[PDB]
């Protein structure tokens, strides 16, 4: 299943996706991706849109 990530950092904004078995594991993948790209902030998830958000 596909899950989305919305990045809202001061130096990086946009969207990516990942294919994971469930949302909980998609979360950790995204959190790593955010971290490897210098985005550190508050995380929320919205199941209706299958979308994670990280905000700096």
UniProtKB/Swiss-Prot annotation:
- Say which domain of life the source belongs to: Bacteria
Where found, per UniProt? Answer: Secreted, Cell wall
Task: Return the sequence repeat spans.
Answer: 3-56
State what protein this is by name: Immunoglobulin G-binding protein G
């Amino acid at each position: 299943m596909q899950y989305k990530l919305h990045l809202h950092g001061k130096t990086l904004k946009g969207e990516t996706t990942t294919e994971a078995v469930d949302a909980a594991t998609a979360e950790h993948v995204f959190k790593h991706y955010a971290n490897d790209n210098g985005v550190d902030g508050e995380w929320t998830y919205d199941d209706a849109t299958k979308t994670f958000t990280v905000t700096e």
